Amino acid sequence: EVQLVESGPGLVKPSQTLSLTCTVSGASISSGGYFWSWIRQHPGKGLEWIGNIYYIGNTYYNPSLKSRLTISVDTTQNQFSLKLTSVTAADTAVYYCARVPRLRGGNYFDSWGQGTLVTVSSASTKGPSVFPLAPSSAALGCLVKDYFPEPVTVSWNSGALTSGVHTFPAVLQSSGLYSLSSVVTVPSSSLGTQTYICNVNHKPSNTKVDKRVE
Amino acid sequence: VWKDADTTLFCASDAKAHETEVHNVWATHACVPTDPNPQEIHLENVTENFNMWKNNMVEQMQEDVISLWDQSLQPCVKLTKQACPKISFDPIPIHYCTPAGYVILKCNDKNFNGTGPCKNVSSVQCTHGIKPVVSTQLLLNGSLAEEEIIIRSENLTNNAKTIIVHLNKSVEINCTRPSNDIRKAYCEINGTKWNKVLKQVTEKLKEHFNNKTIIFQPPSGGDLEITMHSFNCRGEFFYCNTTQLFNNTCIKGCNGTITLPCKIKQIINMWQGTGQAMYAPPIDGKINCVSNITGILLTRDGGANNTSNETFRPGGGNIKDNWRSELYKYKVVQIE
Amino acid sequence: XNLHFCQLRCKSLGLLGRCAXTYCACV
Amino acid sequence: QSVLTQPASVSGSPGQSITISCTGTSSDVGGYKYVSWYQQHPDKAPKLMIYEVSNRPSGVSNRFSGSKSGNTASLTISGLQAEDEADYYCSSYTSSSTWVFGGGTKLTVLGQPKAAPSVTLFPPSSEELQANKATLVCLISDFYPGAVTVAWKADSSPVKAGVETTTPSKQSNNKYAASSYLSLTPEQWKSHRSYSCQVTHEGSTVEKTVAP
Ligand SMILES: *[C@@H]1O[C@H](CO)[C@@H](O)[C@H](O)[C@H]1NC(C)=O
Ligand SMILES: *[C@@H]1O[C@H](CO)[C@@H](O)[C@H](O)[C@H]1NC(C)=O
Ligand SMILES: *[C@@H]1O[C@H](CO)[C@@H](O)[C@H](O)[C@H]1NC(C)=O
Ligand SMILES: *[C@@H]1O[C@H](CO)[C@@H](O)[C@H](O)[C@H]1NC(C)=O
Ligand SMILES: *[C@@H]1O[C@H](CO)[C@@H](O)[C@H](O)[C@H]1NC(C)=O
Ligand SMILES: *[C@@H]1O[C@H](CO)[C@@H](O)[C@H](O)[C@H]1NC(C)=O
Ligand SMILES: *[C@@H]1O[C@H](CO)[C@@H](O)[C@H](O)[C@H]1NC(C)=O
Ligand SMILES: *[C@@H]1O[C@H](CO)[C@@H](O)[C@H](O)[C@H]1NC(C)=O
Ligand SMILES: *[C@@H]1O[C@H](CO)[C@@H](O)[C@H](O)[C@H]1NC(C)=O
């Protein structure tokens, strides 16, 4: 029981408003006994608490943010969300979801979400164009070219080849947009009889496309 | 659909964000806002076995009320100077409250001594608002038997076991330390009110012991804490001589109002653990509190023998009994 | 609670000792 | 709303013991018994490990313990192992009425191998070319430690740019990883006889060459 999932846009323009939503699987009330928190991590750096909310209307915020911040409890309550006005590149961060809780004491962030990256600039979303890269003199893979923002996700053969599979860290070119590659190690015998396809996905521009390799 | 179980509950309070009262401040962390619309649910035809004397909710209220004190109440002099400031201190009501997967069952049996089967069983998700009043001998502003009076005991025949009586009519105590000896202070109780109740007991006590005369007595001996009705006002510890309360005589000819002596002490025995603690002394200002005696604690001598009568005297000191005096009717039960 | 002290303490009067919480009681 | 102070880094060795400190104020750690400890691991979500100064969630080793004296709390790990190499964060409640995490300490478990990199290089894809572009792709992986220095070559023949290059990126299995893409025009690829990718790390240099 009790997971959390951060749903929302991954890009926002400066001076704009940023908004995400979390979704439960537990019961925002109730159950208990428990507050619901928003928490963020600018990449390469640490954790910053953003805010708390109780199933009633109670909200507890970061003094740093109080001028551009609200939290809410939605659809039958169930699910809660973040609204964060007028932003900059310093508001870029991976936004996690967390539950507290406070039984009789312990005030301690658990049930952590997996977080969603939200990038901040005025640049435009841009789906990648994928090419099949094949090997000789081994392991093969799939190149993900010219995309923005991050992140792209490569799956391999609709899920059933976790196997030997490295999906490398991406590079933001000197230009505005990214490019990354993913590779898979296989035996030299196998090839001739296998058909591997990579599954590239980019939600900031619902780009789903698969591409065969030899 | 359920079985008895124990789990870490949670508390709730109407505590306010910025008052400096020690109870409000504790509960602002520790507890959660109170439910605007708490909902009781009378259950089909369910008959349940409660047992106020083996209830893990008691052990939990205990833990809290302790942390609440040794934390809010800072002595002077170290432990095991420390600077002892004067802090606001009135207890607010704390609701205890089941988390996910468990619920609370409540016995609505009006005349019920937290033991045995119940029948009229309800389902709250949060007990009522219980004020954590730490005291001895007398139980202060708190629940009150809806119908007749109730004698609680884990086993009446084992004179060893504290007896909790649940009054069906409240009675005020007016305790004052006037604004100038400062350590000297007193309590007032409307006499004619109080005695009818004591009479009203005895009878309800006599019922439980075969129509044989019921005699009161001062406490045999022990710490000043139990020998005398101890309690806290605005942070100040009171020690009241209750010899006048159990005044067998004033009951044929007699008179009106009662008055107890009572002294404030600054070197007291902790109720929280074995030891002693020093607090700063009072302030030339007036100090008053006014409590409803919602009930009292007795012991019995056993002794007899039997002559033809039972002797009863003040008790207490085991503060868990205070939490029981309210929690008797609830019990935690799991579902998952 | 220290019972044995409590027992000794009440024995002074010829009462027995019992722990009443973290306090000492006599009968 | 403090910032709560942890030492930027620490270090130990297998079987060893080590503690990270967390210092705050009389209002956070002071304060209340609500100090929490989190393990990160790049690139996953935080993991609670100690709550209320010294308690553990079911499913967390006995090696992790929490302490606190005055306005400083500390996390002790014992029987140190590789799977501990991570970021560890401190948090505490705060009088009125907020939480505040600490900086973060990087745990570095010492005494390991010295893995050499593992280069593999892909040429421009038959299909990319047919969209007049190219892109050579060099992939450095499973080395220790970061960093590497990578230099491309045509025939002789220092070339750039090109010539993008990731920074040491640590993986789950403690070993690091980089990547370098040589963007270029299709014609330029047909120009030379072979392009290559020279990876360099401590003593070793490694080459992977490709031809049309
Ligand atoms: C159960 O007890 C409650 C509270 O005392 C009362 O309102 C109700 O009438 C009772 N129900 C039954 C069926 O006796
Ligand atoms: C308490 O009440 C129950 C009835 O539910 C009865 O079984 C029990 O004997 C009573 N005990 C005392 C001490 O009055
Ligand atoms: C019990 O309640 C009344 C009303 O809130 C309060 O004034 C009184 O001081 C309380 N008594 C004690 C001993 O806490
Ligand atoms: C309390 O109970 C007694 C008998 O036990 C009864 O005489 C009295 O009237 C009851 N209620 C009151 C006084 O409110
Ligand atoms: C209650 O106490 C009496 C006297 O000490 C003893 O005989 C008995 O063990 C107890 N009764 C029950 C039912 O436990
Ligand atoms: C209690 O008695 C005192 C006088 O001794 C006086 O303040 C008042 O009449 C009583 N106070 C209350 C609150 O009843
Ligand atoms: C005390 O209460 C009794 C009972 O009603 C009443 O007759 C009397 O007026 C009261 N006395 C005082 C001094 O308040
Ligand atoms: C209380 O005072 C009375 C005077 O009536 C005295 O007999 C009794 O021993 C005193 N007890 C204590 C504990 O002060
Ligand atoms: C108790 O009652 C008697 C009546 O015999 C009277 O002296 C006085 O009012 C009371 N004394 C005490 C100490 O309670």
Subunits close to D (at least 3 CB pairs below 8 A): A, B
Q: Is the Cα dihedral B133, B136, B141, B145 positive or negative?
A: positive
**Are A110 and A6 in a shared domain?**
yes
**Are A57 and A95 in a shared domain?**
yes
Amino acid at C17: G
- Angle among Cα B266, B271, B277 to the nearest 5 degrees reads 30
Query: CB distance D98–A63 less than 8 Å?
Result: yes
Show which of A90, A122, A154 is a domain's final residue: A122
The pairing of strands A6-7 and D35-39 is: unpaired
**Are A52 and A89 in a shared domain?**
yes
Beta-carbon contacts of residue A72 (< 8 Å; ≥ 6 apart): A53, A80, A81, A83
Q: Tell the burial category of B193 from Cβ atoms under 10 Å away from its Cβ (0-12, 13-18, 19+).
A: middle
What whole-number distance in Å separates Cα of residue B300 and Cα of residue B243?
16
CA A173 to chain CA mean position, Å = 21
Annotated resolution, angstroms: 3.2
Give the relative orientation of helices B56-72 and B320-327 as an angle to the nearest 10 degrees. Answer: 130
Please indicate the experimental technique that yielded this structure: X-ray
Residue whose structure tokens are 């491309």? D152
3-state secondary structure of D128: helix
Judge if the beta carbon of residue B228 lies within 6 A of ligand 8.
Answer: yes
Q: Are D76 and D19 in contact (CB under 8 A)?
A: yes
What whole-number distance in Å separates Cα of residue B157 and Cα of residue B302?
8
For D8, the token pair is 């930027």
Give the mutation target among B186, B225, B229, B241 for probing the ligand 8 site: most ligand atoms within 8 A of CB.
B241
Beta-carbon contacts of residue A112 (< 8 Å; ≥ 6 apart): A4, A96, A97, A98, D45, D46, D47, D48
- Angle among Cα D126, A194, A156 to the nearest 5 degrees reads 75
- Per residue, the 3-state secondary structure of B237-271, as one string, reads EEEECHHHCCCCCCCCCCCCCEEECCEEECEEECC
Please give the tally of structural domains in chain A.
2
Please state whether the peptide bond connecting residue B306 to the residue before it is cis, i.e. omega within 30 degrees of 0. Answer: yes
The residue nearest atom 4 of ligand 6, judged by CA position, is B176
Show which of A96, A122, A148 is a domain's final residue: A122
**Are A62 and A87 in a shared domain?**
yes
Q: Are A164 and A185 in contact (CB under 8 A)?
A: yes
Query: CA dist B179 to B281, B283, D208, Å?
Result: 14, 8, 94
Q: All domains of chain D, ordered by start, with CATH?
A: 1-111 (2.60.40.10), 112-212 (2.60.40.10)
What whole-number distance in Å separates Cα of residue B95 and Cα of residue B127?
6
Query: CA dist A196 to A157, A167, A192, B143, D130, Å?
Result: 6, 15, 11, 73, 22
**Are A166 and A88 in a shared domain?**
no
Q: Which domain holds residue A179?
A: 123-214
> How many A from CA of B312 to the centre of ligand 5?
19
Q: Identify the CATH number of the domain in which residue B25 sits.
A: 2.170.40.20
Q: Are B298 and B247 in contact (CB under 8 A)?
A: no
For A8, the token pair is 């929302």
Query: Which candidate, B203, B282, B191, B207, places its Cα nearest to that of B238?
Result: B282
Chain C nearest CA to B35, separation (Å): 34
Judge if the beta carbon of residue B138 lies within 6 A of ligand 3.
Answer: no
What whole-number distance in Å separates Cα of residue B321 and Cα of residue B92?
19
Residue whose structure tokens are 């990883």? D177
Query: Which candidate, B140, A26, C17, places its Cα nearest to that of C27?
Result: C17
**Are A128 and A22 in a shared domain?**
no
For B27, the token pair is 């509960």
A102 touches chain B (CB under 8 A): yes
Residue whose structure tokens are 């016995």? B107
Amino acid at D50: I
Q: Compare all CA atoms of chain B with the CA of C2 and give the residue at the minimum distance.
A: B274
Rg (CA), chain A: 21
Q: Are B167 and B197 in contact (CB under 8 A)?
A: yes
**Are A127 and A151 in a shared domain?**
yes
DSSP state of B22: H
B 25-54 → D contacts, CB under 8 A:
28-29
Please give the tally of structural domains in chain B.
1
> How many A from CA of B240 to the centre of ligand 9?
16
Beta-carbon contacts of residue B74 (< 8 Å; ≥ 6 apart): B82, B83, B84, B85, B87
**Are A78 and A148 in a shared domain?**
no
- Angle among Cα A109, A152, D165 to the nearest 5 degrees reads 100
3-state secondary structure of A91: coil
Rg (CA), chain D: 24
Judge if the beta carbon of residue B193 lies within 6 A of ligand 7.
Answer: yes
Query: CB distance C25–B270 less than 8 Å?
Result: no
**Are A116 and A130 in a shared domain?**
no
Query: Which candidate, B181, B165, B133, places its Cα nearest to that of B300?
Result: B165
Q: Are A138 and A127 in contact (CB under 8 A)?
A: no
**Are A13 and A72 in a shared domain?**
yes
Task: Choose from A58, A133, A212 for mutation: most chain D CBs within 10 A.
Answer: A133
Chain D nearest CA to B74, separation (Å): 14
Q: Which domain holds residue B66?
A: 1-336
The pairing of strands D105-109 and D9-12 is: parallel
What whole-number distance in Å separates Cα of residue D186 and Cα of residue D130?
9
Q: Identify the CATH number of the domain in which residue A153 sits.
A: 2.60.40.10
